[PDB]
Fold Tropomyosin alpha-1 chain.
Amino acid sequence: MDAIKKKMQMLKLDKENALDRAEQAEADKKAAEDRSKQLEDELVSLQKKLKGTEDE
Amino acid sequence: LSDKLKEAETRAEFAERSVTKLEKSIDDLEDELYAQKLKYKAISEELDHALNDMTSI
């Protein structure tokens, strides 16, 4: 009865914590992905600028 | 007839005592059941509240 109420509430809390960990992982993943896109863009920019400097 | 009337009055008084005792007994049983039934209804309403709490997830 009362124990069921509190146990379910603690479970609810465990589920929110699990979603919180998932959201933290997804935020760190989004940061890493933004870094990867910036690095790929700089990489292609560097490769063609290098090709142009080689042509010069 | 006097003897018969005295016997009749004694048995009538006995029956009156009996009805009085039964009236107290039924009043007590009714109160106990009212309390238990209120307990049951409270249990049911709290269970409904619990059910909506689990559905809220």
